[PDB]
């Protein structure tokens, strides 16, 4: 990771953005006031 240079082994995948998007879509705040 970033707080852990030790990261999960991978050669072609997608991990962080995946859960990121899961939580994002979960928000349902179609007008999410944010960044």
């Amino acid at each position: 990771h970033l707080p852990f240079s030790k990261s999960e082994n991978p050669v072609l995948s997608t991990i962080a953005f995946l859960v990121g998007l899961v939580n994002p879509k979960t928000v349902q705040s179609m007008t999410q006031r944010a960044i």
Binding site: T14, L18, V19
Partner: peptide, 29 residues
Amino acid sequence: SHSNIDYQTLLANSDHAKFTIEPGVLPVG
């Protein structure tokens, strides 16, 4: 009709005491 592939809706409800999961969320990590 179909596309060999299933999907999820957005109008169902919750017992609020479930015991089922599914790899449609990608918590990979």
